[PDB]
Design an enzyme around this catalytic site. Structure first.
Site, PDB file in Angstrom:
ATOM      1  N   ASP A  61      40.564  60.358   6.499  1.00 61.30           N
ATOM      2  CA  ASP A  61      40.099  61.383   5.560  1.00 61.30           C
ATOM      3  C   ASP A  61      40.446  62.780   6.058  1.00 61.30           C
ATOM      4  O   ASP A  61      39.790  63.725   5.663  1.00 61.30           O
ATOM      5  CB  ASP A  61      38.577  61.290   5.300  1.00 61.30           C
ATOM      6  CG  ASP A  61      38.216  60.349   4.109  1.00 61.30           C
ATOM      7  OD1 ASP A  61      39.012  60.282   3.145  1.00 61.30           O
ATOM      8  OD2 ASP A  61      37.109  59.617   4.143  1.00 61.30           O
ATOM      9  N   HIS A 104      31.953  60.821   9.551  1.00 65.61           N
ATOM     10  CA  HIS A 104      32.427  59.706   8.735  1.00 65.61           C
ATOM     11  C   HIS A 104      33.628  59.040   9.403  1.00 65.61           C
ATOM     12  O   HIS A 104      33.699  57.800   9.499  1.00 65.61           O
ATOM     13  CB  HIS A 104      32.796  60.222   7.341  1.00 65.61           C
ATOM     14  CG  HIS A 104      33.519  59.230   6.482  1.00 65.61           C
ATOM     15  ND1 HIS A 104      32.925  58.078   6.007  1.00 65.61           N
ATOM     16  CD2 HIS A 104      34.779  59.237   5.971  1.00 65.61           C
ATOM     17  CE1 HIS A 104      33.778  57.429   5.235  1.00 65.61           C
ATOM     18  NE2 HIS A 104      34.911  58.106   5.193  1.00 65.61           N
ATOM     19  N   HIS A 158      32.690  63.749   3.866  1.00 66.80           N
ATOM     20  CA  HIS A 158      34.039  63.327   4.332  1.00 66.80           C
ATOM     21  C   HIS A 158      34.457  64.147   5.532  1.00 66.80           C
ATOM     22  O   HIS A 158      35.392  64.943   5.448  1.00 66.80           O
ATOM     23  CB  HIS A 158      35.074  63.398   3.216  1.00 66.80           C
ATOM     24  CG  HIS A 158      34.855  62.386   2.139  1.00 66.80           C
ATOM     25  ND1 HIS A 158      34.237  62.699   0.947  1.00 66.80           N
ATOM     26  CD2 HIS A 158      35.152  61.067   2.078  1.00 66.80           C
ATOM     27  CE1 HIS A 158      34.175  61.608   0.191  1.00 66.80           C
ATOM     28  NE2 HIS A 158      34.715  60.605   0.856  1.00 66.80           N
ATOM     29  N   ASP A 165      35.532  51.820   5.433  1.00 66.40           N
ATOM     30  CA  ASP A 165      35.264  53.091   4.728  1.00 66.40           C
ATOM     31  C   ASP A 165      33.881  53.109   4.089  1.00 66.40           C
ATOM     32  O   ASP A 165      33.201  54.167   4.052  1.00 66.40           O
ATOM     33  CB  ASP A 165      36.333  53.267   3.672  1.00 66.40           C
ATOM     34  CG  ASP A 165      36.473  54.711   3.212  1.00 66.40           C
ATOM     35  OD1 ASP A 165      37.035  54.853   2.101  1.00 66.40           O
ATOM     36  OD2 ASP A 165      36.120  55.722   3.946  1.00 66.40           O
ATOM     37  N   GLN A 192      23.811  53.605  -7.824  1.00 71.98           N
ATOM     38  CA  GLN A 192      23.999  52.848  -6.587  1.00 71.98           C
ATOM     39  C   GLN A 192      24.049  51.357  -6.842  1.00 71.98           C
ATOM     40  O   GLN A 192      24.926  50.680  -6.287  1.00 71.98           O
ATOM     41  CB  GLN A 192      22.923  53.203  -5.572  1.00 71.98           C
ATOM     42  CG  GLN A 192      23.118  54.580  -4.944  1.00 71.98           C
ATOM     43  CD  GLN A 192      24.441  54.682  -4.203  1.00 71.98           C
ATOM     44  OE1 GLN A 192      24.639  54.031  -3.182  1.00 71.98           O
ATOM     45  NE2 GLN A 192      25.362  55.477  -4.735  1.00 71.98           N
TER      46      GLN A 192
END
Ligand code: JPZ
Ligand code: NI
Ligand code: NI
Length: 330
Positions: free
Chosen positions: A119, A84, A80, A229, A281
Protein backbone atom coordinates in the site's frame (compact mmCIF):
# COMPACT_ATOMS: atom_id res chain seq x y z
CA UNK A 1 6.58 14.75 -4.76
CA UNK A 2 9.57 12.36 -5.04
CA UNK A 3 10.55 9.28 -3.03
CA UNK A 4 11.37 9.79 0.66
CA UNK A 5 14.60 8.37 2.10
CA UNK A 6 15.37 7.27 5.66
CA UNK A 7 18.15 8.88 7.74
CA UNK A 8 21.45 7.25 8.79
CA UNK A 9 20.20 7.33 12.40
CA UNK A 10 17.03 5.46 11.43
CA UNK A 11 18.58 2.52 9.59
CA UNK A 12 21.62 2.13 11.90
CA UNK A 13 19.23 2.09 14.87
CA UNK A 14 17.23 -0.70 13.21
CA UNK A 15 20.43 -2.70 12.64
CA UNK A 16 21.12 -2.73 16.40
CA UNK A 17 17.52 -3.63 17.37
CA UNK A 18 16.97 -6.84 19.27
CA UNK A 19 13.47 -8.32 19.65
CA UNK A 20 12.45 -8.93 23.29
CA UNK A 21 12.53 -12.69 23.98
CA UNK A 22 8.86 -13.16 25.03
CA UNK A 23 7.62 -11.92 21.63
CA UNK A 24 9.55 -14.57 19.69
CA UNK A 25 6.88 -17.11 20.76
CA UNK A 26 3.91 -14.80 20.10
CA UNK A 27 4.97 -13.66 16.63
CA UNK A 28 4.44 -17.22 15.27
CA UNK A 29 0.70 -17.21 15.97
CA UNK A 30 -1.92 -16.07 13.44
CA UNK A 31 -3.79 -13.95 15.97
CA UNK A 32 -0.71 -11.93 17.09
CA UNK A 33 -1.54 -8.22 17.15
CA UNK A 34 1.42 -5.93 16.51
CA UNK A 35 -0.61 -2.97 17.88
CA UNK A 36 0.97 -2.67 21.37
CA UNK A 37 4.57 -2.66 20.09
CA UNK A 38 4.89 0.30 17.72
CA UNK A 39 8.62 1.07 18.35
CA UNK A 40 9.37 -2.55 17.47
CA UNK A 41 7.53 -2.78 14.11
CA UNK A 42 10.58 -2.42 11.80
CA UNK A 43 12.48 -4.88 14.03
CA UNK A 44 9.59 -7.31 13.92
CA UNK A 45 9.81 -7.26 10.11
CA UNK A 46 13.60 -7.89 10.17
CA UNK A 47 12.96 -10.80 12.56
CA UNK A 48 10.34 -12.36 10.31
CA UNK A 49 12.55 -12.06 7.19
CA UNK A 50 15.45 -13.60 9.09
CA UNK A 51 13.33 -16.50 10.42
CA UNK A 52 11.63 -17.27 7.09
CA UNK A 53 14.46 -16.47 4.67
CA UNK A 54 17.67 -16.65 6.79
CA UNK A 55 19.93 -14.03 8.39
CA UNK A 56 22.11 -13.90 5.24
CA UNK A 57 19.29 -13.67 2.65
CA UNK A 58 19.73 -9.90 2.40
CA UNK A 59 22.73 -7.69 3.18
CA UNK A 60 21.70 -6.31 6.58
CA UNK A 61 22.55 -2.65 5.84
CA UNK A 62 20.55 -2.62 2.58
CA UNK A 63 17.63 -4.38 4.30
CA UNK A 64 17.54 -1.82 7.13
CA UNK A 65 17.75 1.11 4.68
CA UNK A 66 14.98 -0.50 2.60
CA UNK A 67 12.67 -1.04 5.59
CA UNK A 68 13.12 2.44 7.03
CA UNK A 69 12.61 4.12 3.63
CA UNK A 70 9.46 2.01 3.08
CA UNK A 71 8.10 3.26 6.44
CA UNK A 72 8.86 6.84 5.31
CA UNK A 73 6.80 6.43 2.11
CA UNK A 74 3.64 5.45 3.95
CA UNK A 75 1.47 8.49 4.67
CA UNK A 76 -0.14 9.51 7.98
CA UNK A 77 -3.58 8.31 6.92
CA UNK A 78 -5.96 6.57 9.34
CA UNK A 79 -5.77 3.01 7.90
CA UNK A 80 -3.59 2.47 4.80
CA UNK A 81 -0.46 3.26 6.74
CA UNK A 82 2.76 1.75 8.14
CA UNK A 83 0.87 -0.19 10.83
CA UNK A 84 -1.30 -1.83 8.17
CA UNK A 85 1.80 -2.79 6.10
CA UNK A 86 3.46 -4.54 9.04
CA UNK A 87 0.18 -6.30 10.01
CA UNK A 88 -0.20 -7.65 6.49
CA UNK A 89 3.48 -8.76 6.41
CA UNK A 90 2.99 -10.56 9.73
CA UNK A 91 -0.02 -12.52 8.47
CA UNK A 92 2.05 -13.58 5.44
CA UNK A 93 4.86 -14.69 7.79
CA UNK A 94 2.42 -16.86 9.72
CA UNK A 95 0.97 -18.40 6.50
CA UNK A 96 4.52 -19.03 5.15
CA UNK A 97 5.76 -20.59 8.42
CA UNK A 98 2.80 -22.99 8.49
CA UNK A 99 3.25 -23.87 4.78
CA UNK A 100 6.98 -23.29 4.44
CA UNK A 101 8.11 -25.85 1.88
CA UNK A 102 5.25 -25.21 -0.53
CA UNK A 103 7.06 -21.96 -1.37
CA UNK A 104 10.49 -21.33 -2.80
CA UNK A 105 13.10 -19.15 -1.06
CA UNK A 106 12.53 -16.59 -3.82
CA UNK A 107 8.76 -16.60 -3.27
CA UNK A 108 9.06 -16.21 0.52
CA UNK A 109 11.39 -13.22 0.25
CA UNK A 110 9.30 -11.72 -2.55
CA UNK A 111 6.04 -12.12 -0.66
CA UNK A 112 7.20 -10.67 2.68
CA UNK A 113 8.59 -7.66 0.84
CA UNK A 114 5.44 -7.39 -1.36
CA UNK A 115 3.30 -7.31 1.79
CA UNK A 116 5.38 -4.61 3.44
CA UNK A 117 5.18 -2.56 0.24
CA UNK A 118 1.67 -3.31 -0.96
CA UNK A 119 0.00 0.00 0.00
CA UNK A 120 3.01 2.31 -0.45
CA UNK A 121 2.11 6.01 -0.74
CA UNK A 122 -1.62 5.38 -0.30
CA UNK A 123 -3.45 8.68 -0.01
CA UNK A 124 -6.56 7.49 1.78
CA UNK A 125 -8.61 7.45 -1.45
CA UNK A 126 -10.10 4.46 -3.27
CA UNK A 127 -9.75 3.39 -6.91
CA UNK A 128 -13.42 4.43 -7.27
CA UNK A 129 -12.53 7.98 -6.30
CA UNK A 130 -9.47 8.26 -8.55
CA UNK A 131 -11.37 7.02 -11.58
CA UNK A 132 -14.60 8.94 -10.91
CA UNK A 133 -12.66 12.22 -10.74
CA UNK A 134 -9.96 11.44 -13.33
CA UNK A 135 -6.89 11.79 -11.10
CA UNK A 136 -3.65 11.61 -13.16
CA UNK A 137 -3.04 8.15 -11.64
CA UNK A 138 -6.24 6.81 -13.31
CA UNK A 139 -5.00 8.03 -16.69
CA UNK A 140 -1.65 6.32 -16.20
CA UNK A 141 -3.08 3.12 -14.72
CA UNK A 142 -6.44 2.27 -16.30
CA UNK A 143 -7.25 -0.61 -13.95
CA UNK A 144 -5.95 -1.55 -10.46
CA UNK A 145 -4.97 2.09 -10.26
CA UNK A 146 -3.52 2.46 -6.80
CA UNK A 147 -2.02 -1.07 -6.86
CA UNK A 148 -0.02 -0.25 -9.99
CA UNK A 149 1.16 2.88 -8.17
CA UNK A 150 2.18 0.89 -5.09
CA UNK A 151 4.32 -1.41 -7.28
CA UNK A 152 5.85 1.58 -9.01
CA UNK A 153 6.70 2.97 -5.54
CA UNK A 154 8.30 -0.33 -4.52
CA UNK A 155 10.60 -0.21 -7.57
CA UNK A 156 11.45 3.48 -6.84
CA UNK A 157 12.63 2.57 -3.31
CA UNK A 158 14.69 -0.42 -4.59
CA UNK A 159 16.37 2.01 -6.97
CA UNK A 160 17.54 4.31 -4.17
CA UNK A 161 21.29 4.18 -3.54
CA UNK A 162 22.11 1.33 -1.16
CA UNK A 163 18.49 0.08 -1.03
CA UNK A 164 18.48 -2.71 -3.60
CA UNK A 165 18.05 -5.78 -1.42
CA UNK A 166 17.65 -7.99 -4.52
CA UNK A 167 20.87 -7.02 -6.31
CA UNK A 168 22.62 -10.24 -5.29
CA UNK A 169 20.11 -12.43 -7.11
CA UNK A 170 21.17 -13.77 -10.51
CA UNK A 171 19.83 -11.74 -13.45
CA UNK A 172 17.16 -14.43 -13.93
CA UNK A 173 16.06 -14.65 -10.28
CA UNK A 174 15.96 -10.87 -10.05
CA UNK A 175 13.44 -10.69 -12.88
CA UNK A 176 11.47 -13.49 -11.33
CA UNK A 177 11.24 -11.85 -7.90
CA UNK A 178 10.08 -8.52 -9.30
CA UNK A 179 7.35 -10.41 -11.18
CA UNK A 180 6.33 -12.24 -7.99
CA UNK A 181 6.12 -8.85 -6.26
CA UNK A 182 4.21 -7.18 -9.10
CA UNK A 183 1.66 -9.96 -9.32
CA UNK A 184 1.21 -10.08 -5.52
CA UNK A 185 0.66 -6.33 -5.21
CA UNK A 186 -1.79 -6.26 -8.12
CA UNK A 187 -3.68 -9.13 -6.52
CA UNK A 188 -4.46 -6.87 -3.52
CA UNK A 189 -6.99 -5.14 -5.79
CA UNK A 190 -10.21 -6.50 -4.31
CA UNK A 191 -11.87 -6.13 -7.73
CA UNK A 192 -9.65 -9.03 -8.90
CA UNK A 193 -10.27 -11.10 -5.73
CA UNK A 194 -13.82 -12.05 -6.69
CA UNK A 195 -12.80 -13.75 -9.93
CA UNK A 196 -9.68 -15.26 -8.42
CA UNK A 197 -11.50 -16.93 -5.52
CA UNK A 198 -14.22 -18.26 -7.86
CA UNK A 199 -11.56 -19.77 -10.16
CA UNK A 200 -9.62 -21.27 -7.25
CA UNK A 201 -12.80 -22.76 -5.74
CA UNK A 202 -13.58 -24.49 -9.08
CA UNK A 203 -9.99 -25.72 -9.54
CA UNK A 204 -10.06 -27.08 -6.00
CA UNK A 205 -13.51 -28.73 -6.20
CA UNK A 206 -12.84 -30.35 -9.62
CA UNK A 207 -9.39 -31.48 -8.49
CA UNK A 208 -7.51 -29.63 -11.26
CA UNK A 209 -5.63 -27.35 -8.86
CA UNK A 210 -1.90 -27.96 -9.36
CA UNK A 211 0.91 -26.00 -7.65
CA UNK A 212 3.46 -27.16 -10.26
CA UNK A 213 1.43 -25.02 -12.73
CA UNK A 214 2.66 -21.41 -12.62
CA UNK A 215 -0.74 -19.84 -13.28
CA UNK A 216 -2.18 -21.85 -10.39
CA UNK A 217 0.67 -20.79 -8.09
CA UNK A 218 0.05 -17.17 -9.07
CA UNK A 219 -3.63 -17.48 -8.15
CA UNK A 220 -2.93 -19.20 -4.81
CA UNK A 221 -0.41 -16.43 -3.97
CA UNK A 222 -3.10 -13.93 -4.98
CA UNK A 223 -5.54 -15.38 -2.50
CA UNK A 224 -2.83 -15.39 0.19
CA UNK A 225 -2.39 -11.67 -0.50
CA UNK A 226 -6.11 -11.00 -0.04
CA UNK A 227 -6.13 -13.05 3.16
CA UNK A 228 -3.17 -11.06 4.57
CA UNK A 229 -4.63 -7.71 3.45
CA UNK A 230 -7.94 -8.44 5.19
CA UNK A 231 -6.47 -10.00 8.32
CA UNK A 232 -7.82 -7.38 10.71
CA UNK A 233 -10.97 -9.54 10.50
CA UNK A 234 -9.03 -12.50 11.97
CA UNK A 235 -7.83 -10.84 15.18
CA UNK A 236 -9.53 -10.87 18.55
CA UNK A 237 -12.78 -8.89 18.46
CA UNK A 238 -11.62 -5.71 20.29
CA UNK A 239 -8.68 -5.45 17.82
CA UNK A 240 -10.99 -6.06 14.82
CA UNK A 241 -13.41 -3.39 16.08
CA UNK A 242 -10.70 -0.77 16.68
CA UNK A 243 -9.27 -1.38 13.23
CA UNK A 244 -12.74 -0.94 11.71
CA UNK A 245 -12.86 2.58 13.24
CA UNK A 246 -9.67 3.41 11.33
CA UNK A 247 -10.95 1.97 8.01
CA UNK A 248 -14.11 4.04 8.35
CA UNK A 249 -12.22 7.23 9.26
CA UNK A 250 -10.71 6.92 5.78
CA UNK A 251 -13.97 6.07 4.08
CA UNK A 252 -15.77 9.07 5.66
CA UNK A 253 -13.05 11.53 4.57
CA UNK A 254 -13.39 10.30 0.96
CA UNK A 255 -17.19 10.59 1.11
CA UNK A 256 -16.86 14.18 2.36
CA UNK A 257 -14.82 14.98 -0.77
CA UNK A 258 -17.48 13.44 -3.05
CA UNK A 259 -20.18 15.63 -1.47
CA UNK A 260 -18.08 18.71 -2.37
CA UNK A 261 -18.00 17.50 -5.98
CA UNK A 262 -21.82 17.19 -6.06
CA UNK A 263 -22.02 13.37 -5.83
CA UNK A 264 -23.68 11.55 -2.91
CA UNK A 265 -21.20 8.96 -1.65
CA UNK A 266 -22.09 5.32 -1.16
CA UNK A 267 -23.55 4.84 2.35
CA UNK A 268 -20.30 3.21 3.49
CA UNK A 269 -18.38 6.47 2.91
CA UNK A 270 -21.10 8.69 4.39
CA UNK A 271 -20.32 9.86 7.96
CA UNK A 272 -24.00 10.75 8.29
CA UNK A 273 -24.93 7.08 7.79
CA UNK A 274 -23.02 5.38 10.62
CA UNK A 275 -26.14 3.42 11.56
CA UNK A 276 -25.62 1.34 8.40
CA UNK A 277 -22.10 0.21 9.42
CA UNK A 278 -23.01 -3.08 11.13
CA UNK A 279 -25.06 -4.33 8.17
CA UNK A 280 -22.24 -3.06 5.89
CA UNK A 281 -19.78 -5.19 7.84
CA UNK A 282 -22.08 -8.21 7.66
CA UNK A 283 -22.17 -7.72 3.87
CA UNK A 284 -18.38 -7.51 3.64
CA UNK A 285 -17.86 -10.67 5.73
CA UNK A 286 -20.45 -12.60 3.76
CA UNK A 287 -19.30 -11.48 0.30
CA UNK A 288 -15.53 -11.13 0.78
CA UNK A 289 -13.95 -12.25 4.08
CA UNK A 290 -15.64 -15.56 4.82
CA UNK A 291 -15.35 -16.94 1.25
CA UNK A 292 -11.69 -15.85 1.13
CA UNK A 293 -10.65 -17.73 4.27
CA UNK A 294 -12.90 -20.63 3.40
CA UNK A 295 -11.14 -21.20 0.09
CA UNK A 296 -7.71 -20.50 1.60
CA UNK A 297 -8.33 -23.16 4.30
CA UNK A 298 -9.31 -25.72 1.64
CA UNK A 299 -6.09 -25.12 -0.29
CA UNK A 300 -3.80 -24.58 2.72
CA UNK A 301 -5.29 -26.48 5.68
CA UNK A 302 -2.89 -24.99 8.27
CA UNK A 303 -4.54 -21.61 7.69
CA UNK A 304 -7.78 -22.81 9.33
CA UNK A 305 -7.29 -20.54 12.41
CA UNK A 306 -7.85 -17.49 10.16
CA UNK A 307 -11.23 -18.90 9.06
CA UNK A 308 -12.25 -19.73 12.65
CA UNK A 309 -11.39 -16.18 13.81
CA UNK A 310 -13.21 -14.61 10.85
CA UNK A 311 -16.30 -16.66 11.69
CA UNK A 312 -16.08 -15.49 15.33
CA UNK A 313 -15.96 -11.83 14.19
CA UNK A 314 -18.89 -12.36 11.86
CA UNK A 315 -20.84 -13.57 14.88
CA UNK A 316 -19.80 -10.40 16.75
CA UNK A 317 -21.18 -8.13 14.01
CA UNK A 318 -24.36 -10.19 14.17
CA UNK A 319 -24.50 -9.43 17.91
CA UNK A 320 -24.12 -5.70 17.17
CA UNK A 321 -27.04 -5.89 14.74
CA UNK A 322 -29.21 -7.61 17.38
CA UNK A 323 -28.30 -4.80 19.88
CA UNK A 324 -26.23 -7.09 22.12
CA UNK A 325 -23.00 -4.99 21.91
CA UNK A 326 -21.10 -4.36 25.20
CA UNK A 327 -18.85 -1.46 26.31
CA UNK A 328 -16.28 -0.30 23.74
CA UNK A 329 -13.26 2.02 23.81
CA UNK A 330 -11.72 3.85 20.84
O1 JPZ B 1 -12.62 -2.84 2.87
C1 JPZ B 1 -13.06 -3.28 4.04
N1 JPZ B 1 -14.36 -3.09 4.37
C2 JPZ B 1 -14.83 -3.54 5.56
N2 JPZ B 1 -14.02 -4.18 6.45
C3 JPZ B 1 -12.71 -4.39 6.15
C4 JPZ B 1 -11.88 -5.06 7.07
C5 JPZ B 1 -10.53 -5.27 6.75
C6 JPZ B 1 -10.02 -4.81 5.53
C7 JPZ B 1 -10.85 -4.15 4.62
C8 JPZ B 1 -12.20 -3.94 4.93
NI1 NI C 1 -4.45 -1.58 -1.23
NI1 NI D 1 -3.77 -3.13 2.11
Amino acid sequence: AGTSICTSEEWQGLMQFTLPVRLCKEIELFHFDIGPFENMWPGIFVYMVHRSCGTSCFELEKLCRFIMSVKKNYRRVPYHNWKHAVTVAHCMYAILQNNHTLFTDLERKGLLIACLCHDLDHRGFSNSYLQKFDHPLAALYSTSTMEQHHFSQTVSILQLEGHNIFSTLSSSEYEQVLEIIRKAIIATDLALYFGNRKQLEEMYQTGSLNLNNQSHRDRVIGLMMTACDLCSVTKLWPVTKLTANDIYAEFWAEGDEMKKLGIQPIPMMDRDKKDEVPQGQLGFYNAVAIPCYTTLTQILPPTEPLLKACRDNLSQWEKVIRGEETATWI
